[PDB]
Design a protein around this nucleic acid. Structure first.
Ligand SMILES: [Zn+2]
Lengths: 176, 131, 141, 38, 136, 94
RNA sequence: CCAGGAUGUUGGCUUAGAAGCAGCCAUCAUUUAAAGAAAGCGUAAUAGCUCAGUCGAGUCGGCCUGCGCGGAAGA
């Protein structure tokens, strides 16, 4: 509702194509094409994109609010781009990237080879740190979650893949 | 929470009555400052530790409006802090000027010396006035 | 005047120069030495009088020693040799216990020249008279 | 998590969210406050 | 528990609980727990309900019990043929009509009132509502 | 002080009284002085909030019926068996 | 959301030590737009978290009531 009341601005070069309920945001980096719900009514005017409900639906604004943030991130991805840094804490935990595949050695008796989706590239400035980059915030967040499941840091030392913006709390090992 | 109507009428009514007798009222930006600095600025102006107070552009707008004053809205943009003088020569502009020790001036948006409006390029003129 | 940067405060009195049983290695485990608490500490402490629990900031950077500036001690340490008894309250409020007064703690909390807010010798003066009565003591002001 | 017909907001960080049709209690300060079947 | 220290009779018929209640207003304290549903309160339910509120208030204020069992209940054990005389009294209950001021409290804040009766109402079989002393 | 709009009833009996409680209304009666009793039907909600104040049972009331302000006073009130509602209130001309 | 969230004072007694955050009490004052001698976690005592000017119009939650929800697992 309120969020939908805040029109989103699109930088220069950001080509926006609307086809009924489809939104194609192609800019400097990558191109995203998301399909809105059906109760949302996007209006391309001037150099911004407004959002509003549609007569005949209950939630109405409940959908316009999301579509406001959705296309919003779509523009941010095709302009500045999103990034997620996941560092590997622990002994023997290393990381390597050979092309579009990421090899991880989380103590496993066999190096894991995660496969990157559509447009998701990442390197490693350190043997224990990965930097994911993409144009889709939803995707870059899922890929970071996959590598986050391979080894969830325990509340004792935090050993395992974590997030650069995540705080892991630890605890003692009980007495006796 | 919030402040009841009757409780807000007084707040603005007070800041207005003190503005009618204030010989001066300089406005400036005080963001990123600490308490130790604020106190130091208060100790410099008056040993009573009371000087330089932060107020909203609204509380000041309707306060400067409740009193015959004009052309000051430009001095009320975003973070605003007022510094008036109800007694003694309003030449205490040198104190704050030297306190900010800034080679610029922008911070000290404007002021009103003796009912006379003054821009930001005049904050130094008064801060360099001889005894 | 800036931000957080080490500044503990644990002492028992001004007499005990760098004690051990009370605290000891507790006053220096991050950047303070459990020995130099007599050089820079008693740098002027023995030049006045040792008998009032006086705390102090730490302030440590990375230059070995520290530049801690001692200041005015608690206003309670004046409630054992400046207000009256040193202890023994018997019963909390079931009895008025003891009792201070106006003249008492008057020129005792005035010596403070490195603390207190507001120079108004009437608002910052009575500010050191609340606790003196908060312990069940009566007010003879 | 502790599942039981009754579900409430223990701490102030509690939140009563409905998923698929089941009341749940999400927490971000105490994993013990995690509930289900409300 | 609460039960008549003496009764002119040991047993009593069924006795239906019809009509409304009498004690609807508080005439002893400033607050109190009022009944809404229909049923009967046993000596255990009443006693247990008292401990709850009495405990939620530490040892301050005062509580009153407008209700009282004063009604014996007979029941026959297992492996017993029907008849052979009326059963034996096992416990005493109290008929509670919609609007019966169950308990009352005074000497404590209004907030602590609801909380107290809240932990006591959960002990009661029937529903209840919080009421406050009214003038006239 | 407390103005309470009223309207003379057209039928008495528990039957009519009940039909009133099923429309946010309740029966009433104003007796006292040399005047004869008068059936009155006050609004539930309205009076439901007016009685919430202790000044409603202390200070004098002013009922306006058929263009007439009769200064009365709360004599007695009958509350709902268990719900926070009203059944009937007696007023006295004073 | 980005903010601030201070000071007397580590309040007095108790204690190995308790400083808002064992526990007895007490609960005034202060500079203010506002900050409780202090909500929860956390410390051996501290520390560290943290709750109670901008943006620009809607927000907060008890009560009466309708319709629903979970509560609801058998061969
Ligand atoms: Zn929780």
């Amino acid at each position: 509702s309120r969020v939908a009341k805040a029109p989103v601005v699109v930088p220069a070069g950001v080509d926006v194509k609307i086809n009924g309920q489809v939104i194609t945001i192609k800019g400097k980096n990558g191109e995203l094409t998301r399909t809105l719900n059906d109760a949302v009514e996007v209006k391309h005017a001037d150099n911004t994109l407004t959002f509003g409900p549609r007569d005949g639906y209950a939630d109405g604004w409940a959908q316009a609010g999301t579509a406001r943030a959705l296309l919003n991130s779509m523009v941010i991805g095709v302009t500045e781009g999103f990034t997620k840094k996941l560092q590997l804490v622990g002994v023997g935990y290393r990381a390597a990237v050979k092309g579009n595949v990421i090899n991880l050695s989380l103590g496993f008796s066999h190096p894991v080879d995660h496969q990157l989706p559509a447009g998701i590239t990442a390197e490693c400035p350190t043997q224990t740190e990965i930097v994911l980059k993409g144009a889709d915030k939803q995707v870059i967040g899922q890929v970071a979650a996959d590598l986050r499941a391979y080894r969830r840091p325990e509340p004792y030392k935090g050993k395992g893949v974590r997030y650069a913006d995540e705080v892991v709390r630890t605890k003692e090992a009980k007495k006796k | 929470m919030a402040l009841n109507l009757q409780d807000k009428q007084a707040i603005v009514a007070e800041v207005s009555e003190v503005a009618k007798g204030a010989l001066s009222a300089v406005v400036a930006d005080s963001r990123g400052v600490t308490v130790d600095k604020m106190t130091e600025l208060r100790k410099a102006g008056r040993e009573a530790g009371v000087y330089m107070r932060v107020v909203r552009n609204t509380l000041l707008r309707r306060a400067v409006e409740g009193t015959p004053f004009e052309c000051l809205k430009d001095a009320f943009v975003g973070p605003t802090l007022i510094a008036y003088s109800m007694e003694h020569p309003g030449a205490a502009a040198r104190l704050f000027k030297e306190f900010a020790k800034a080679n610029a001036k922008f911070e000290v948006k404007a002021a009103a010396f003796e009912g006379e409006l003054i821009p930001a390029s005049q904050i130094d003129r008064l801060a360099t006035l001889p005894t | 005047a800036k931000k957080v940067q080490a500044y503990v405060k644990l002492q028992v009195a001004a007499g005990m120069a760098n004690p051990s049983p009370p605290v000891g290695p507790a006053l220096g485990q991050q950047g303070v030495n459990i020995m130099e608490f007599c050089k820079a500490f008693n740098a002027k402490t023995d030049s006045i009088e040792k008998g009032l629990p006086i705390p102090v900031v730490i302030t440590v950077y990375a230059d070995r020693s520290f530049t801690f500036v001692t200041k005015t001690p608690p206003a309670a340490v004046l409630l054992k040799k400046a207000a009256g008894i040193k202890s023994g309250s018997g019963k909390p409020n079931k009895d008025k216990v003891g009792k201070i007064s106006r003249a008492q703690l008057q020129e005792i909390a005035q010596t403070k020249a490195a603390d207190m807010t507001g120079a108004d010798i009437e608002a910052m003066t009575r500010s050191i008279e609340g606790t003196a009565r908060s312990m069940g003591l009566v007010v003879e002001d | 998590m502790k599942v039981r017909a009754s579900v409430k907001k223990l701490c102030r960080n509690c939140k009563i969210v409905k998923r698929d049709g089941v009341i749940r209690v999400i927490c971000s300060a105490e994993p013990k406050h995690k509930q289900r079947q409300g | 528990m609460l039960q008549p220290k003496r009764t002119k009779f040991r047993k009593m018929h069924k006795g239906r609980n019809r009509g409304l209640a009498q004690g609807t207003d508080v005439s002893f304290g400033s607050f109190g727990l009022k009944a809404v549903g229909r049923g009967r309160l046993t000596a255990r339910q009443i006693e247990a309900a008292r401990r709850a509120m009495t405990r939620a208030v530490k040892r301050q204020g005062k509580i009153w019990i407008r209700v009282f069992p004063d009604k014996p209940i007979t029941e026959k054990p297992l492996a017993v043929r029907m008849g052979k005389g009326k059963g034996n009294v096992e416990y005493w209950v109290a008929l509670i009509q919609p609007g019966k001021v169950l308990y009352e409290m005074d000497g404590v804040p209004e907030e602590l009132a609801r909380e107290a009766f809240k932990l006591a109402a959960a002990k009661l079989p029937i529903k209840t509502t919080f009421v406050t002393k009214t003038v006239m | 002080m407390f103005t309470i709009n009223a309207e003379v009833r057209k039928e008495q009996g528990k039957g009519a009284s009940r039909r009133l409680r099923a429309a946010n209304k309740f029966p009433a009666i104003i007796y006292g002085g040399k005047e004869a009793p008068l059936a009155i039907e006050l609004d539930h909600d309205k009076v439901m909030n007016m009685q919430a104040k202790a000044e409603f049972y202390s200070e004098v009331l002013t009922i306006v019926v058929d263009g007439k302000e009769i200064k009365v006073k709360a004599q007695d009130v009958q509350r709902h068996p268990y719900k926070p509602k009203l059944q009937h209130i007696d007023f006295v001309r004073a």
